[PDB]
Structure formats: structure tokens, C-alpha cells
Design a protein around this nucleic acid. Sequence first.
RNA 1: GUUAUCCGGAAUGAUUGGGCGUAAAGCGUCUGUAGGUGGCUUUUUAAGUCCGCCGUCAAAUCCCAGGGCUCAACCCUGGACAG
Lengths: 199, 187, 133, 233
Amino acid sequence: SRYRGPRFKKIRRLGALPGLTNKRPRAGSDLRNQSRSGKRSQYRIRLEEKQKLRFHYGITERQLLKYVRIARKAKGSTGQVLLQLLEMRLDNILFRLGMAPTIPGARQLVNHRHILVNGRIVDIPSYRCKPQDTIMARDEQKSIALIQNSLDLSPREELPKHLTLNPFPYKGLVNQIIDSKWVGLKINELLVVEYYSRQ
Amino acid sequence: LGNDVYAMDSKIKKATGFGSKSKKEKIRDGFEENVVQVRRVTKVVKGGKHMRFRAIVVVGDKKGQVGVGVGKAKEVVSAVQKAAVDARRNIITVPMTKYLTFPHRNEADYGAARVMLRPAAPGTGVIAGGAVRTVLEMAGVENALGKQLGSNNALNNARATIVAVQTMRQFSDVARDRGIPMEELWK
Amino acid sequence: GKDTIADIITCIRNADMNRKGTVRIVSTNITENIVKILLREGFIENARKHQERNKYFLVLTLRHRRNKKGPYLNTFHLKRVSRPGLRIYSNYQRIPRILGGMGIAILSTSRGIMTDREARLEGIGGEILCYIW
Amino acid sequence: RYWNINLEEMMEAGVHFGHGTRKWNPRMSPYISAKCKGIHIINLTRTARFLSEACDLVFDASSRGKQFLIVGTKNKAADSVARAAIRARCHYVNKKWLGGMLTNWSTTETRLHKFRDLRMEQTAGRLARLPKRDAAVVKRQLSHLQTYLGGIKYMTGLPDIVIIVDQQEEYTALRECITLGIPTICLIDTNCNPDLADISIPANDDAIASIRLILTKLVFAICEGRSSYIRNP
RNA sequence: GUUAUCCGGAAUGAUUGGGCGUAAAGCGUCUGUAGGUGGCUUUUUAAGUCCGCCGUCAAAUCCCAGGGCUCAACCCUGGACAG
Ligand SMILES: [Mg+2]
Ligand SMILES: [Mg+2]
Ligand SMILES: [Mg+2]
Ligand SMILES: [Mg+2]
Ligand SMILES: [Mg+2]
Ligand SMILES: [Mg+2]
Ligand SMILES: [Mg+2]
Ligand SMILES: [Mg+2]
Ligand SMILES: [Mg+2]
Ligand SMILES: [Mg+2]
Ligand SMILES: [Mg+2]
Ligand SMILES: [Mg+2]
Ligand SMILES: [Mg+2]
Ligand SMILES: [Mg+2]
Ligand SMILES: [Mg+2]
Ligand SMILES: [Mg+2]
Ligand SMILES: [Mg+2]
Ligand SMILES: [Mg+2]
Ligand SMILES: [Mg+2]
Ligand SMILES: [Mg+2]
Ligand SMILES: [Mg+2]
Ligand SMILES: [Mg+2]
Ligand SMILES: [Mg+2]
């Protein structure tokens, strides 16, 4: 139920995908055969957008679909609510807090019971995080070592204003609900919403 | 009076030859053309089948300005181009709301093409079929419901869409027509 | 003349589409009230009454041509709703509103004729005579 | 600014009458006036307001620096047009009017290019060095090109104000300006529809006198507007 | 994935939402019974119609707001538009 396949590859075809890979793609070397499909059918544009989303967060389709139903339900602007929902996933928050290298990494971190949300172990990636929530490492040697090395050796200080990080114990804190401008990717949710008119 | 030869050679040098001056200026007009349909229509002659290409193309800025045009030639390329040029001289403006959608619900009729547009909440995107959707999208309408009832001809549906969004009245104007303040009609 | 209301409406629609400012209609409590209302909404220039051989005629002046007769962006639409065949009524929470409120809906209610606006203020439903664009 | 018109002069030149009552367009019934002996009589109080607004827009247009065409192709109006244009120093069409003069500009203007070469040829006297067939041929080209290009032969670029006589016969002028985004200021008799012109002046068709009156008032406005644009640029 | 079943798309049985000169479609033409609809003005009544209040339309389900199984599915509490 997880994408274990070649990553660079999906990246060449989709675009830039942070939650997947930090290695910038090869020059692309397709300039020999110069093979194109011509251009893309409007359908293919829509499809590639959705795929962008899906692989950035490591979600399965059947899951994405149910997020979208939750989205159409919710009273509000649909694409926005969707992006909220996807961006509140525990593993993704674990990632954007620099507590992980990438999303498969963060996911693994959560799975192996190395993380705590308000003094309780949550081992499932898709646990939805709500405002005022404590993201901690379990107090064991291993957990702490992991989080420390992956947090410190990665310099990025981009923290998106709803996310606090605190230094020695390493208490991360979820402050509030995401803003559409603070979202974790370049995507027109409009296209995805459109793709999903038929479900 | 200056001499006839140098002034007529001035209007001759200012109207430039079409055999010494190549053509690409079009991205300077701030537009984008979208080929909706390419078909091979045929005239028939004693020799045989004489093949032409019809192009149905719509132009917009994606900023609230759109038009349709149709063209015919031997090669895809030239048809496409004439289509562009024709649309550019047929063009109109679509009334928009602060959220990028339609003022109101509207139908439209052209030939056997009937068209129904109604405004949508922001965040629903543009959901429609081929002609209607490319025209809408190229106008820059962000959120709209549309369905074409009646026929399916790509072309008549394009025209129809245009007649729809042409007859769209914006509130300031109905307030100007009726002679009544805005806040009164809002209620 | 099976329906009188529909007929007034029609005389307008027709005289309108033919670019005439002046219409003769036959008066009635209903007719008169509807036209009054049409004036206070502002869809029509001016009304007046005439009498001959015990017949009453409301002549209606109509909004002038739109910056010529050939180039008209706007027409003035009318549509019958409750008609002798099927009478349509609505409670307070189904009261129609036309093109987000740009147009108007005429209602006959217990308090007399009005628009949908009035019906919402006073909290009343009733029989829906017609719509106007 | 004021213009020269009074009920007495309009009476004098004979503007107020128009074609028989079997020939009429009821489209003009809104502003017609009376009907006498099977001949229609048109409102002059409407005629004066239209003629004033016509001369006023003509004045603003000349003063800003815009360019003028005039058109009528009748036999008498053609003789009055060459002189109207010369007195106002404008462009004219009197002789046979060619479909496409306005709308199809590109080809029209190439036809102007070759007309200019013909005009240099003729005055150079290099038409004396030819066979007789060549000279009579070059002279066909000349005869035509004079009929068609004579009054416009100065104008380069698209004309943005067009004036016209008797829109009944002139259908294509009206069509082409309708198409190209050009104003028409036009003479209406009892037979013509007031759709086709931007400003349409109730007027007379059959009378050389009416043509002379209204065209002279108009060319006087073009001339005073010509002094004001000779001043402003 | 394939097959079966049902609704959709189908405005293709159409109240919302189609048609009948030539495309499927106006009885060969009238007279007329039931039935449907029917001009204007005042009054009455209040059957429709409208507004308020009450009773009920079991619980579960669907919808909204919280809570519990680490999450979700699922369970539990409270409440309500329709009609
Ligand atoms: Mg599964
Ligand atoms: Mg594979
Ligand atoms: Mg477990
Ligand atoms: Mg669906
Ligand atoms: Mg039709
Ligand atoms: Mg369809
Ligand atoms: Mg009811
Ligand atoms: Mg159906
Ligand atoms: Mg029906
Ligand atoms: Mg059918
Ligand atoms: Mg047959
Ligand atoms: Mg048949
Ligand atoms: Mg028959
Ligand atoms: Mg029979
Ligand atoms: Mg009978
Ligand atoms: Mg009977
Ligand atoms: Mg009865
Ligand atoms: Mg009655
Ligand atoms: Mg129940
Ligand atoms: Mg809930
Ligand atoms: Mg819970
Ligand atoms: Mg319950
Ligand atoms: Mg109830």
C-alpha cells in the first residue's frame, strides 16, 4: 500500500516533488531520441496534477478519494479544504518540522512507534493533527538519536508559521490550521477538483 | 509641395513588402490561441477529392477577454492561423465577479446548440464539455457550471457560449437601468 | 382571453421585441396593480389611464431603445408561472428569486400583490403570478 | 459654437419633402411629419437637431485631426461632391464605388501603388516610347484608376469618419463602415431605414437643392473645424 | 480484471425538461355528451392558499455538533431542516 518504486523517475515526469526527493534530477538526457507524446490531452494535464499531489504525500488513490468526499462535504472552498486535510497528516507534519529527511522517512518514523502526540504513541501515518498538539520523540535512545541527527544536519529554516519547534527536549507544536499560501507544493487545486467531478 | 516620387516612395516604404518581411508578431498582442477542433472537409472535383482542413479555434488572454473564429486551408498550420486572425476581429468581453465567475444563471441558443451556464462557489473550478469548457477557460472564468443541451457541434456550442456570456448583465448596470441603488436590489 | 394576466404580459413582451415605446393594455385590479409595481421596480417609463365606451386602457411608455435599435444588448423578458392549467404556490422558504435578485418575482398574497422583497420582509408566501427579468 | 440653420432656409432649399407613400419605410414613422398628395413630408424640427449634432461631431472630429470621406454616386450629387471635397480639402467618392474600398484595404492600397506608378509614367512622357496597344492599355488602366481612385488618391491609412449621400443606393458604404468601426453621417429620405447610419439626417433624395443645402452647411462645419485643426496641432 | 444486476450519462416516455409543413407524428370533416379550462365589477364564505401555535410521523440510518476505540471504518450522546 506504499510506493516503493523508483522515485527520480516519477519526478522527471511530474515536476518538482519535495516530499519525495532531495536529489535534483539528471539533465534528463531525452534530447537524443527527442521523443514526445506530441502534447498533452487536457485530461493528461489534470491527471498529472492529481498524481503530483498523491506522490508528494504518499497517499493511495482510494484514500485520496475519501479525502475528496470529506472535502465536498465541508462547508468552504473545496480545493482549499482538501489541501488542508492532506497537509495535516502526521507524517507530513513530522516532515515539515524537519524531524525527518523525506516523507517515506517520516512515515517510517511514525510506523515504528518512535513518535508521541500528547504523551501517547501514535504509529499510524494518516493520523490527523489538530491545533494545539504536541509532537514529541519517544524518550528512548534510538528515537532521540534519529530525530536529533535528521533535525540538526538539515539546515532548512522555512518553518511555516503554524509550526513551532523547541530546542533541547525537541517539542514540536502544531499551532493552528494551514493557510492556502503556506501549502507544501505548487498545485492548482482547481485542476484536481476538476479531475474528480466523475469520482 | 514635395515631389510625388519621394512621398509615394514614403508611403511605399511605410507599407512594407509581404515578400521581404517575415511574419512572427503575435505574442506581442498579449494573446493565446487554442485549437479546439481540426477536421478534414472535402470538395469534390472531376479529378478526385480535394482536401482541406477546417480549424475551430478560440482566443483568450485568460484575463476576461475571449473570442471564437473558424478557418479553412490546405495545411493544418495555415488554417490555424486564419482561425486566429478571424477570432481576433470577432472578439468580446465576459462579465466577471470578484471571485472569477458569472453574475448570474443564463441559457443560450444557436442552431441546435443550447447552452446552460450557472455561477459556482469559488473552488469548484470549471466543469463543462469541450467547446463550452475551452471557451470558458480561455476567457479566464475560474468557477462555472455549464452544460450544453441539444446538439453537440463543437462550433455552434462555442458561438452559443459567446451569446450566453454576451448577454450577461452585471449588477451595476441593472442598477443603472432600473434606476435603483445597488443595496436595494442586493436585498 | 382565457387568461388575462398572461395576456397583458404578452402584449408587453411583443411590443417590446418590436421596439415600440407605447402599448395599449386593458385595465383591471390585477393589471393596474401589476403595472404600478412594474413602475416602482422601474422596468417601464410611465403609465396612464384612458376611457371610451366603458372600456379602460392603460397605456405604457417603455424604456427607450438601447443606443440604437439594431445593436440591443438587453431585452426585457417576461414569463407566466401559475397559469390556469397548473397553479404554483410557495411557502416563505421557497419564495423564488430571479437571477440572484437582479430580476423580480410577482406574488399574490393575503396582503395583496407584491414583489418577493416585500414577501420576505413581511414573512408571507402565496401564489406566484410571473417572473420578470 | 453655432451653425447656420433656420426654418426659412430649410424651407427655401426644399428639404421637407420625400418619396411617394407607396414607397415608404414605416421604420421612419416615428420622426416623419405629414403626408400630402401622395408625397411624404418629413419633420424639420428633427432635421435641425440632427444637422446641428452632425455639424458638431464633424467639428470636433476635424479639430482633433481625423480624416474625412464623402460619398454619393448619383449623377448630380457627383458633380456637387468633387466641389464639396475641394472646398473642404477632404477625400471623396463620386464616380463608381468599388466594393471593398474600406474593408479590404490591403489590396485597395496595392491598387493605389500601381495608380501612383501610372501617374509618374504619364507625366514623365515615357508612354510615347510604346506600341499603340501598350498606350491604349495603359490608358484603360488610367481611365478606370481615375474613376475609382480619384477622390481617395491622397489618403493613406484607414479613414475614420465617413459622410454619405442617400443610403439606399450606397448599401456597401454603410455595410463597410458598419463593419470597420467607422461613423456614418447620412442623408435619409422616406424610403431608407434609420439603422445603417450612426447619425442619420432626415433629408431629400431627388433634389440637387437639398443636397447642396445640407452638404454646404456640413462642408462649412468641416472648414471651420479645418481652421481649428490647422490651429491646434 | 471479466461477466450478471440496477440507476446514471439518456433532454431516449420530457412536471422541472421534447416534439408533430418536409425528419417518427394532426383523427378525412364536422355536431355534440361526460371531463377540463373560461371576461369584467362589488359582497359573502373560507374549500384550496398563506402565517402562528400543538400532537405525531418508533429506535437505528442519512445530515449538523461534540465524545470513545492509538487513526479510520465502526460505536455513543445531543439536536434539527425538509416533507
Ligand atoms: Mg486497502
Ligand atoms: Mg510496474
Ligand atoms: Mg498496532
Ligand atoms: Mg455524476
Ligand atoms: Mg430549437
Ligand atoms: Mg448531452
Ligand atoms: Mg405545501
Ligand atoms: Mg430520464
Ligand atoms: Mg413537457
Ligand atoms: Mg425529438
Ligand atoms: Mg418521407
Ligand atoms: Mg411524415
Ligand atoms: Mg387535417
Ligand atoms: Mg376515421
Ligand atoms: Mg364541438
Ligand atoms: Mg359542458
Ligand atoms: Mg367554473
Ligand atoms: Mg376572473
Ligand atoms: Mg427516526
Ligand atoms: Mg463528526
Ligand atoms: Mg477520535
Ligand atoms: Mg442519534
Ligand atoms: Mg412537520
